[PDB]
Amino acid sequence: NQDTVIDLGISFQIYVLQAGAWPLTQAPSSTFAIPQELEKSVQMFELFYSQHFSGRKLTWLHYLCTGEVKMNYLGKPYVAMVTT
Amino acid sequence: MYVKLISSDGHEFIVKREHALTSGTIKAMLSGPGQFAENETNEVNFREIPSHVLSKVCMYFTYKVRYTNSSTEIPEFPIAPEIALELLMAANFLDC
Amino acid sequence: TSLKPRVVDFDETWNKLLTTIKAVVMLEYVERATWNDRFSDIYALCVAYPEPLGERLYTETKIFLENHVRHLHKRVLESEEQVLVMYHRYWEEYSKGADYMDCLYRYLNTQFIKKPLMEIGELALDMWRKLMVEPLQAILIRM
Amino acid sequence: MEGLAGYVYKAASEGKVLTLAALLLNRSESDIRYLLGYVSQQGGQRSTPLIIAARNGHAKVVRLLLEHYRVQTQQTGTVRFDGYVIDGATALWCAAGAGHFEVVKLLVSHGANVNHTTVTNSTPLRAACFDGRLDIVKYLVENNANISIANKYDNTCLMIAAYKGHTDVVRYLLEQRADPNAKAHCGATALHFAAEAGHIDIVKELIKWRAAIVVNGHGMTPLKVAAESCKADVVELLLSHADCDRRSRIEALELLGASFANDRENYDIIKTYHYLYLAMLERFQDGDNILEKEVLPPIHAYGNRTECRNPQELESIRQDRDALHMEGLIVRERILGADNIDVSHPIIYRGAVYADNMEFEQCIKLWLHALHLRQKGNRNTHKDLLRFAQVFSQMIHLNETVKAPDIECVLRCSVLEIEQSMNRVKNISDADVHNAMDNYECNLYTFLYLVCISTKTQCSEEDQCKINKQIYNLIHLDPRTREGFTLLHLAVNSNTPVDDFHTNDVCSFPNALVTKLLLDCGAEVNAVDNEGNSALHIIVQYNRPISDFLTLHSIIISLVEAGAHTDMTNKQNKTPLDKSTTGVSEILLKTQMKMSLKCLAARAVRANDINYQDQIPRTLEEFVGFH
Amino acid sequence: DVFLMIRRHKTTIFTDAKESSTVFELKRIVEGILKRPPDEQRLYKDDQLLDDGKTLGECGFTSQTARPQAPATVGLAFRAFEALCIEPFSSPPELP
């Protein structure tokens, strides 16, 4: 329902948590940031989240985040989802 | 599926029926006695409103159908000062 | 001749309206062009200067509806043996006429009455109830 | 010169003579006369420098002012500061009311004003009688001041000095051949006034001159007023006057015993039982020809007990404290009557005691009967409706079920009382316009609280129908606040005042359910105040939707479904989209903006400021008005 | 999302289609709404013919010009090519 709809076959999902109660933290000070093919609408999600929560930007921590990875280079004997 | 709208000035403004069913008075005019076959003609002669106002209200019909819930960005409807007033004076008789 | 309040003559306009809505409530075929002209005449009657004739038109069509319903009541009560079939025929005719009339009086329905009184379709059904099934209640329920 | 007037007012406030003379010299005559004959405005009250000279006891400075000038004491000023502060009185009235003999005697000795009939028709002798100093009164007698100067309510010196504890002035007037029966507009004698305050010496003084007994406007002899005010010694003196029969004695004793049962200042239940038993014994004194009771059918508020017509009936409830309270209320109703103004207050006190003891049901019944009696007597019941609002709120806050017919009865009482409030505001607009307007505001707020409590209480279908009937009957009267808020506006407004008592926890504004009930009860959603804001205009002013989105969500959809224009324009020409403080209100409004060509054309016409008068229909004139 | 205002004398049709398309289906839909054979009809953009295989995205109007409002005064006429007799809309009255 965007003004300009963005196309993606990459299947975003939302498991954002609350740092005000969750004991999660990231001692790694070197964020690996994000590849371009994932940033199709993550920024647009930040605008979507700021519709009701404009006072906070998406504090991304990736030590617990994961991601499905294909195995097309060898015939895919398995689907090995790994951390981001 | 294509209803005909005749102005007092003789200009016809045939538009899609779904576009023309967003006006309550047109809703009643198409309904009531008879609906013809397929509404191929379904003619109604708006013998009072001017032709430019009928063109503007058909434009608004297209505008409303296109942007009934089209997100939050909606183009501004351009209205000339000389074409206003009488547009709303006829927007009574074409209650939307 | 745009949509200005032209101070229209009530007599000829109300006579034309009377003929057209009589045809409508009797479900007689009526001209589409005359139907749209009657829409224009309703808008002329509900707007014309120096005072709105909407209350006058409302009372006039109230009188028309009540005398038509009473005439149908007299016909049904005269048709003693087939009171039920006649009542069903006149009920179908009057309900279709009431919906079509409420469509015709749409501008008056949502511009003057809403701004006390009841809607023209609601008024038609209420007149049918209070003058057709309210007097002819015991006969209908017994049959 | 108002600065010079304030300066000389300050100089006379300290009782200074030399600085006043230095400030009231080296000038012409007209300005000096204006300075000595005008009022300075301090604290919102205008008073002459003579008033501040007499008030603080500075009699020497005003005496030398009378010596050095010809200033009069006829200057218009207030009466007192004890909750009246009404002007129109003279300066000598304030001097007598100040309570100093020297200033009054010097003001009388130089331009006496002992015959000033003010707007309240009160001479300074009446002010001296209120002070009660016998020297001032006898000095005004020596100056030959009339004593029959009745006040606004036909109140004379005798009644004024007998309502307050001053037996000396009353006695001196009594041997001065005053009015033995000083009737008033209130229907008093000063025996009633003596009984209201228990000045037993003044009662003795009036008895020694045989001041007689009359019936009050509410149907009360002075003995009955003495019994009602819980004052036994006045009952003694008015019973010893021997112009009272067995029935009068019996009813006075019964009323006194009942009045001791319910009064906060003097609540002695043993006195109640003993006086009631003494009354009952004298009822059955003769064995035969007994003055049997005349008990009314039982009142549902006091259980259903029909008083006590037997000595054993009263003996059975000697230690039954709550039953004795109910018997006292029954006896008060029986003798005082349902129309008296004094019968309501002990019922309210007993209800308050029950509420503080969590006897909520009996409290509701008692306050309901008190409300019925006060509405039948046509009294201001804005506070009692408020009390109903808290006791329902505390009932809900303490998780106790509230019966629907009680809310129906209090809502019917609220609707009728708001009707009489509308009548009063239509009638009264100058005397107590602030008081009547504040009562109107409080009545509207209490109605909102009761509706909110109705929403939080589950009821039957017919109970909901009755509540909706009451709300419909109020709404189709269109109540209006100071700023023009409708009843829907106040429920929408988050700035609506909530009482500091138990209504805070339960009655919260804005409440979505209250708006929904008002809307389906027939609220005029399109109505606007004098500012021009609509119901949609104030709901987008809601500051904290993050705490409760559902409250905001279910009223925005409710207002739009009602038919409120999204593009409504106030007096300063702002749409509710422009007044949306938070983003979520803007989003919900945009999802609820049911736009149309009429609205867009109206916006274009209003922006262009083109001519539209006497061309379009008048409904379109209104449409351009609010678009 | 392209819009068009096909004009043939007093007759006027408001049409919605896709920007990336052709005028073949435009001829077919004016055939359907006019109840006349389609080969006689010949669309004109500012009084000039265009190919039946020419895309309407390059006919002279785009999605940012052929808005839901008045897109373009596209003329039409019926062959017995033909003559483009397009009457202008009635002049609005002068503003007071």
Word description of this protein:
The structure is cut from a larger assembly and holds 2 copies of chain A, 1 copy of chain B (96 residues), 1 copy of chain D (627 residues) and 1 copy of chain E (96 residues). With 84 residues, chain A is low in regular secondary structure. Helix content of chain A is 10%, strand content 5%. Chain A has a two-stranded antiparallel sheet with strand order 1-2. Chain A is flat. Chain B is built from 4 helices and 4 strands; from the N terminus they run βββααβαα. The longest helix of chain B is centred in the middle third of the chain and has 16 residues, at 51-66. Chain D has 33 helices and 2 strands. Chain D starts with a helix and ends with a helix. A 3-stranded mixed beta sheet of chain E has the order 2-1-3, with no helix packed on it. The B-E interface holds B 2, 7, 9-16, 19, 40, 50-52, 55, 58-59, 61-63, 66-67, 75, 77-78, 80-83, 86 and E 1, 3, 10-14, 16, 33, 35, 67-70, 87, 89-95. Chain E: Residues 1-65 form the Ubiquitin-like domain. Chain E: Its main location: nucleus. Chain E: It is found in: Nucleus. Chain E: This is Elongin-B.
The main sheet of chain A comes to:
2 strands, antiparallel
Overall body shape of chain D: flat
Percentage of residues in DSSP E strands of chain A: under 5%
| Strands of chain D, count | 2
Over the alpha carbons, how many angstroms does the gyration radius of chain A reach?
A: 15 Å
Strand order of the largest sheet of chain A: 1-2
Q: Helix amount of chain A, in percent?
A: under 10%
- The count of helical stretches of chain D stands at 33
Number of helices of chain A: 1
Strand content of chain D: under 5%
Largest inter-chain contact set:
B-E, 31 and 22 residues
PDB class: protein binding
Keywords: ubiquitination E3 ligase, Cryo-EM, protein binding
Entry title: Cryo-EM structure of CRL2-FEM1B (dimer 2)
Chains A, C: Cullin-2
